[PDB]
Symmetry: C3
Subunit: 262 residues, 3 copies
């Protein structure tokens, strides 16, 4: 009887250590749940182009699925809500980096895409490109005090991309919102590029001026919500341990009935 009681107590202690260690492990490695919430119209995204010396020639919201034939090389109709700012980025506070903010397409369901055009007069770069950062809401920037702070924060909160000459980078930008355990939800942008070579036959002259193109489009109406989940909470652990403790008490009590039997 004493032997089996000691065995049961050893099982209980082993189980307590077991569950405590398993709870410690399950707190370090929370599992993630990713859910897609279809959205009919995305909030106006903010595209932070950094033209530098480049000159915008045209910007439009092509509600259609395919851009129409344009008139490249010369200035064209401007039909975008473009905001311009000059600030100093925190990572290179010494230098001032001028940006150029544009309002991206909203009608994702209707396949609305904003097509841009840029041009740069002859220079000696030999690797010409225009950076661009994407942030979730353009209106939020358009109505936020101290735009310099907002842009500096975005410089850290978003990674740097770019597009180059003789190309039409068709950036199918998409959202992925991350929720950290503290409750706040950070929003990050995913985007897949598809470079489309520019057939420069139309000028066919000594113009030969760097011409850039981009088509910012919403990949699909799904917003990928990614949130970490803590699979282990002390509540379930304590309930399970109490159930096991009672399970052991009943076995010990049945040992007394066995003693009476013998």
């Amino acid at each position: 009887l004493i032997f089996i009681y000691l065995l049961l107590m050893a099982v209980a202690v082993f189980l307590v250590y077991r569950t405590i260690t398993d709870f410690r492990e399950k707190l370090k490695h929370p599992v993630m749940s990713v859910s897609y919430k279809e959205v009919d119209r995305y909030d106006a995204p903010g595209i932070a182009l950094y033209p530098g010396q480049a000159q915008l020639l045209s910007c439009k919201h092509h509600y259609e699925v395919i851009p129409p034939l344009t008139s490249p090389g010369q200035p064209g109709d401007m039909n975008c809500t473009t905001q311009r700012i000059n600030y100093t980025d925190p990572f290179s506070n010494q230098t001032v980096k001028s940006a150029l903010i544009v309002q991206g397409p909203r009608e994702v369901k209707k396949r609305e895409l904003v097509f841009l055009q840029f041009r740069l007069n002859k220079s000696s770069e030999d690797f010409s490109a225009i950076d661009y950062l994407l942030f979730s809401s353009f209106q939020e920037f358009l109505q936020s005090p101290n735009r310099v702070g907002f842009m500096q924060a975005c410089e850290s909160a978003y990674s740097s991309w770019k597009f180059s000459g003789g190309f039409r980078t068709w950036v199918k930008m998409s959202l992925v919102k991350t929720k950290e355990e503290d409750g706040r939800e950070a929003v990050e942008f995913r985007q897949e590029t598809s470079v489309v070579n520019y057939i420069d036959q139309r000028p066919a002259a000594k113009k030969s001026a760097q011409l850039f193109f981009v088509v910012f489009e919403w990949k699909d109406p799904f917003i990928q919500k990614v949130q970490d989940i803590v699979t282990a909470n002390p509540w379930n652990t304590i309930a399970l341990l109490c159930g096991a403790f009672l399970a052991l008490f009943k076995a010990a009590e049945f040992a007394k009935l066995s003693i009476k039997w013998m």
Copy 2:
């Protein structure tokens, strides 16, 4: 005694609240499990190219790892199971969009890749590209009645890509199958592009005709099965709650022994 009994009852009520709220939460945010099932030979994938005015010049299944030297510009050997169809997409039912379906490589382990060539006679598009959609099984399309319905369904069930001129888009297409809770398993295609500029020195004449190239390849023999998991089920919850309720009953009964002691 009454005070401790009321305390135990309050613990029971607040704990059943705990568990019911947590269970309600755990249905909303199911956790995901991703498993890779190595496959020796993928099912013949269906590549739905939309040449438009472009003219296919060559299509082959290069069992080797590297394409050999070709004869660009002029028609070449055709060695692909190409299916042609004209239909109207649901999103643009007004217009008729002609497709061109091809049978992709199967021998993933052997690094089998299907290399295509397209050509377009001089036009005034100025951004020339050929769309292409990928669907899981080409034979399923080749033996399914009402191909128009199948293609229209695919137009919604797969995203739109394309490749452009003077390029060799080496699309390393890969599979990712999703299982929704209802039981059906939707299949989606992932594919990473690697644009390879075309060195057009060979013609070096007034031909200067848009020439496209693509190399559809299976990235690896792994099919990424993604399935959502409901971490919480009512019966684990009810068992845990019953264990906790018994654990509370035993404490209340030990309170009677304490009363006898005092």
Copy 3:
């Protein structure tokens, strides 16, 4: 009384069956936990370029954020720890594939990037590119016996990429470490390309020699640790089941009190 006892026994049998089945299911589909561990300085990555006939012209570690103006076409300063090897890959053991290993950037926080230049004398390929494989630690290769075995293993442990002519493939290489249940942690590279067309105006002569460019950079200081988790372990299952068994015993005993009542 016998009817309710049989009902309780049937419930117990159903519950044990269901718990065993659910434990069997939860062992097949383990859930994954992905954690990002910020790293100040990545270990020197090993870039296994396969120039073939191409001739390296320059390699440098640009601690700045932007490459400076270069002197394309002619040999330049070489400031990289380049290792050269010729071996035979397992998949094509018949042929010998010569590689060229380079020491990649380490100072991720400083936006340190290694910029390379390659050149190929006139050939008849018309699709010119240089393959490159990424492996986690360059020093590990630099101090490992039988480098041929290391390279052959990497040929299977990493996928094949490449960059082409007239381009500056800005490969923002990033790390993702996978832990299989056995305990070993396989390391894989994710990398997103951004092709930047090369404006070849500077030579403007009959040189017209294939020039390749690449900028290998660390995307961000986060290492994506991906590890599978077994949500079900026999120990929780047995504790829950025996707690439910006790919950059944107490109900059966309350049935006796009900009998006494009636």
